[PDB]
Symmetry: D2
């Protein structure tokens, strides 16, 4: 596509997939510009929103955005870039720890040529595919950067049990 | 082992065909399927999913066609999947203005599986199409019809056909 | 991911033919011409040589039940080299879990390969990637449906052996 | 609940990346993974054929085989492992530089629960998906280990044009 979107819960390998795709384009001598979030820990810039990238991205064939849920203007950015002929690849969570959608990523679903939702493996039961991220630490902050020390991926029934 | 599977994409992408392909697979394994449309294999047409009542509980698989028309689809699918049903939904992710059907987006975040199909561009005939363009003048977001009122188009065709 | 040769495989009752048709319908809707070949536009033949050159007038060529045609790889390659979108639905494996060599060859020549699954008709609980023959017969080709075959998961296939 | 998953496609399609993506998923769920290359615990081994791995693989939940086309006995190995309840994941070329199949990988297709054929991007025209590997050095050895110094991935028409010479 022109906008390709990779979603799924944490630990599903979304970033790995993003990089797999970028690497394919790099082997064909296509120029890739990789955008990461400031906060999150193959890169080009780290920013807190996509406005701050300015116009540098126009010099490249492929634009990759990692952790798309953190950028509040991601839909507009991707559309602008794709209209300028760029292949835009975005990796992002579709859902927060409360199973509520990141509205901006949803909007991207509707504008995307390609949408792939990856799965993880349930870290609780170890037996099923996992489509949900459960927060293991008490915090009401929606944006809380961290890894397996603060989150685990779970299947539907594990998510319910743990919520109780 | 309930689950939610979601099939999205623009019109003429064969979403309904895919829904039926999946249902047929379960039917061959003697699993009971209940098919809901917007007005054992059981069939019913309703205007909202509340109106289906509890009949669906007697079945292994629940299929919902044209999910964008049901305003309570997310809740329904979650209830059914929590009761152990395999729930399969076919739906438009985007309206004719490229805006998301908010309820289907919510379903993306709750789904075990998400597949976004493409159509073929009906304007240029040369590219994959991820968008639906309305060919008749009307501002009603809900307007039931086929190729007499809509065509599927690629990204650039959608832009050019919008400007004229 | 589509292409010039697209291949759809999997066991019986996986909906391969349905998927083939889904893809054909997409093209038809974009006013592309489609020629549909079945085993003994539309035509039924016993091998693809017998179709002659009629296929050249069409944008898309669809072959259903590809495992039955002994020359399918060559046909698909000729057609795809002539600019056709070639879509083939076929069993990858026979009832003894042995490959249909001509397909497995196509795999290597295909732009796109999708292996569909069925639902296990024995345990009713798991995805099925194998076809088990339920009637006694040693003919590798034996045309029929759920009266002669069922699709099964790996462990059911073993146990039923 | 053993299974065989097969990842195929031409060179530079990210097959090995995908293999590792899948392994990493299992690792995060504390499943043990044993990774076999050609010559929660993750074990690694390099061998020239799969007989040489012996029985160590039985201690693990997931078995991953990279570069499957190099192992002449891969089908039998995967089937044995999957029958013992292992999740077996294989990354391999389906086709050689002459577009001929690796027969053993084809056999695996027929035994696999899952088959995914990845594509690369055409390194010649830069404009299309690539499903074929073209060898850029003169050699008749079917096995010739190397990277972009000896191979490029190409689309169908580029493969044809390049072959004409
Ligand atoms: C589930 C999460 C995750 N996160 C964070 C944790 C990680 O830093 C990041 C997920 O990275 P990933 O897309 O899995 O490579 O987002 C939230 O801020 N809110 C949530 O509700
Ligand atoms: C693009 C559309 C389509 N529709 C309607 C027309 C069709 O009856 C139906 C699409 O059927 P489908 O989901 O493609 O099997 O949705 C809308 O109401 N609003 C839109 O914006
Ligand atoms: C499993 C089979 C099935 N068949 C036949 C039975 C059906 O006529 C056909 C099924 O193809 P389909 O799955 O519909 O595309 O193939 C064989 O000839 N040999 C086998 O080993
Ligand atoms: C196309 C090839 C490639 N090769 C080699 C080059 C690499 O070492 C390896 C492929 O790596 P890959 O499966 O992409 O991780 O196989 C052959 O020996 N013969 C062929 O015909
Ligand atoms: Zn679980
Ligand atoms: Zn177009
Ligand atoms: Zn079974
Ligand atoms: Zn090319």
């Amino acid at each position: 596509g022109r906008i390709e979107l990779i979603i799924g819960p944490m630990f599903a390998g979304k970033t790995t997939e993003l990089m797999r795709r970028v690497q394919r384009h790099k082997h064909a001598q296509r120029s890739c510009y990789i955008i990461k979030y400031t906060g999150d820990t193959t890169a080009n810039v780290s920013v807190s929103n996509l406005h701050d990238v300015g116009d540098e991205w126009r010099k490249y064939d492929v634009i990759a955005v990692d952790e798309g849920q953190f950028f509040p203007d991601v839909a507009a950015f991707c559309s602008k870039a794709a209209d300028s002929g760029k292949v835009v690849i975005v990796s992002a969570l579709d859902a927060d720890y409360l199973q509520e959608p990141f509205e901006e990523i949803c909007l991207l679903v509707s504008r995307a040529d390609s949408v792939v939702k990856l799965s993880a493996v349930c870290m609780e039961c170890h037996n099923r595919k996992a489509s949900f991220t459960y927060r293991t630490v008490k915090s009401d902050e929606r944006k809380l950067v961290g890894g397996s020390d603060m989150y685990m991926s779970v299947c539907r029934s594990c998510y319910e049990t743990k919520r109780n």
